[PDB]
Design a protein around this ligand. Sequence first.
Ligand code: HEM
Ligand code: HEM
Ligand code: HEM
Ligand code: HEM
Ligand code: HEM
Ligand SMILES: O=S([O-])[O-]
Ligand SMILES: [Ca+2]
Ligand SMILES: [Y+2]
Ligand SMILES: [Y+2]
Ligand SMILES: [Y+2]
Length: 471
Amino acid sequence: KTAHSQGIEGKAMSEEWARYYPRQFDSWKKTKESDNITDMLKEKPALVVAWAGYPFSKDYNAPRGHYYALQDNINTLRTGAPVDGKTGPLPSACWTCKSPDVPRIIEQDGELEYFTGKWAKYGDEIVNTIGCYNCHDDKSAELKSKVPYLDRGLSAAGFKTFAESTHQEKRSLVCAQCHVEFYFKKTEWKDDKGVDKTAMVVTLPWSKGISTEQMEAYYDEINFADWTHGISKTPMLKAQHPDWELYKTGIHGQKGVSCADCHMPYTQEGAVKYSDHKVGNPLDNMDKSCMNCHRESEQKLKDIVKQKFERKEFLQDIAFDNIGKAHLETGKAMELGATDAELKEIRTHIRHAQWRADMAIAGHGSFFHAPEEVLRLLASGNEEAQKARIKLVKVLAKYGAIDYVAPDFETKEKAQKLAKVDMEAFIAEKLKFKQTLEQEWKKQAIAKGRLNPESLKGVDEKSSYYDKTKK
Ligand code: HEM
Ligand code: HEM
Ligand code: HEM
Ligand code: HEM
Ligand code: HEM
Ligand SMILES: O=S([O-])[O-]
Ligand SMILES: [Ca+2]
Ligand SMILES: [Y+2]
Ligand SMILES: [Y+2]
Ligand SMILES: [Y+2]
C-alpha cells in the first residue's frame, strides 16, 4: 500500500505526486529536454498534397517530449483560433491524449459530455500536460488505462482488456491509450437534462483486428472518410500514429518486449528498481534501453537502425510522390470534366494507397518497431497509387490531356499553394488567439488552481511558425 492510499488531492497535477515519488517526477519532467520542432511538411512536402483539404496540410510536426504535448496541441495551426468556447475548427476530442485533466474531466462530466463540443470548450480546464494521472491510479499507483476507448478497442479486436492483461502487457497498453490510430465517431446522445447532444468520440477502428488492412476493411465497411480530398475529392482516411498497432506486428512486440522496456528502462539501485520516466529516444540511452538484450556495440546497433530509417525513407518518398501525383492528376481530370463514375476506381485506389502509406509512416518509430511491415505497407500503398495513375492516364487521354505533367510539390510553399493553404492567414489568426484567449485560459486556470505556472516554464518557446530561440 502507498503513502497516498486514499488518493491524491489535485491528482491531475503531476506536481502533486512529487511528494511521494520525487525520482519518477524528476525524470518525467525531463521530457522538457526534447524540445525540437521538426516541421514535417517542410521535410516532406508531399504530405501537404496528401493532406490537402485536411488540417495536417497546415501544420504537422514530429513528436517531441511529453512536456510539450498540451502546449503543442494549443499551438498547432490545426486547432486554429477560437474566440470563445464555441468556436475553432476542432472538437473537444483533441485534448484527449494530451493531458491528465482529460480523465479528470471524463470522471466528472462523463465520457459523452467530455466528447461534446469544441476543443475551445475546455481551454481553461485542460491545462496540464501528459502526467502521472494519465497512467497511474492515484491510490495504488498501479498502471491504469484512464480512457474508456482503449478497452473498447481491445475487446473489439479480441484482445484482453487492460485489467485482464499481464503486467508486461500493461507496460505497453498504458502507452496505447494515446499511441494508437483512431477516428472520431459522431455519437448522438441525450444528457441528464434530456438535451439532445452530439459527441465526437475517440474510437479505435479495431473491430476487424489491428492490421492496416483490417482497419481499412473496417473503414470501408462503414464508408468512413476523415475528409474529402481538396484536390482529388477522394474520400480519404487519415492514419494517426498507429504506434502500438504496428509495434504488435514487429519482432520486439511479438517477443513480448514492451514499450516501457525500451522507452522507460529500469535502473537498479540495490533492492530498489526505478523506471526512467524521461520518455524519449531510446537510442540516446542505449546501454539501458538496448544492451540488456543485445551484445556488440551501440554504434553497430545505431547503424542498423539508421539503415532501417533509410529504407523507409526511400519507399516513403516513392509512395508519396505517386500518391501526390495521383491526387493532382485526378484534380486535372476533374478540371477537364471527368465524372465521379469515371474516377471512382481511381479514388478508391488513392484512398487505399494513402491509408496504407500513411499507416506506415504516421508512427514515427514504426520503421524500427515493425520494419518489415512498414516496408510492405509502403510497397502496397505505392502499388495502389500506381494502379490509380495507370488508370488516370486513360482518363486524362479521354479528355485530351495525356501529356499532362502533374505540378511539382518539392517545397512546402509550392505544395501548400497547390493545396490552397493560406498559412500566413492561419498564422496571423493563431497568434491573435494565443495573445488573447489562450492567455485568458491560462490565467483562469491558474486562478482556479488547475494550473501551476511552474509547468509553463519554457513550454511555449517554439512552434512550426515561431521560435523564441530558448526552449
Ligand atoms: C510509456 C508509454 C509511452 C511511450 C513509450 C510513449 C512514447 C512517446 C515518444 C517516444 C514520444 C516522442 C518523445 C520525444 O520526441 O522526445 C512521445 C510523444 C508524445 N506522446 Fe507518448 N508515449 C507513451 C505514453 C503516452 C500517453 C499515455 C499519451 C497520452 C496521454 C501520449 C501522448 C503523446 C503525445 C501527444 C506526444 C507528442 C508530444 C508533443 O509533440 O508535444 N504518450 N511519446
Ligand atoms: C484532432 C484532434 C487532435 C489534435 C489537434 C492533436 C494535436 C496534436 C499535435 C499538435 C501533436 C504534435 C505533433 C504534430 O504537430 O502533429 C500531436 C501528437 C500526438 N497526438 Fe494528437 N491531437 C489530436 C488528437 C489526438 C488523439 C485523440 C490522440 C490519442 C488517441 C492523440 C495522440 C497523439 C500522439 C500519441 C502524438 C505523438 C505521436 C505523433 O505525433 O506521431 N492525438 N497531436
Ligand atoms: C510524474 C508523474 C509520474 C509518477 C510520480 C509516476 C510514478 C511511478 C512509480 C512510483 C512507478 C513504480 C516504480 C518505478 O518503476 O519507477 C512507476 C512506474 C511506471 N510508470 Fe510512472 N509515474 C509517472 C508518470 C508516468 C506516466 C505519464 C506514464 C505513462 C505514459 C507512466 C508509466 C509507467 C510505467 C510503464 C511504469 C513501469 C511499471 C512497472 O514496470 O511495474 N508513468 N511510475
Ligand atoms: C507500443 C509501444 C511503443 C510505443 C508507444 C513507442 C513509441 C515510440 C514513438 C512515438 C517513437 C517516435 C519518436 C519520435 O518521433 O520522436 C518511437 C521511436 C522509437 N522507439 Fe518506440 N515505442 C514503443 C515500443 C518500442 C520498443 C519495444 C522499442 C525497443 C525494442 C522501441 C524503440 C524505439 C526506437 C529505437 C525508436 C527510434 C528512435 C526515436 O525516434 O526516438 N520502441 N517509439
Ligand atoms: C532501443 C533498443 C533496441 C534496439 C536498437 C534493438 C535492435 C534490434 C534489432 C535491429 C533487431 C533485429 C530485428 C529487426 O529486424 O528489427 C532486434 C531483435 C530483437 N531484440 Fe532488440 N533492440 C532493442 C531493444 C531490445 C530489448 C529491450 C529487448 C529485450 C527486452 C530486445 C530483444 C530482442 C529480441 C528478443 C529480438 C528478436 C531476435 C532474437 O530473438 O534475438 N531488444 N533488436
Ligand atoms: O493529431 S494527433 O493524433 O497526432
Ligand atoms: Ca485515423
Ligand atoms: Y499535495
Ligand atoms: Y521527437
Ligand atoms: Y527485421
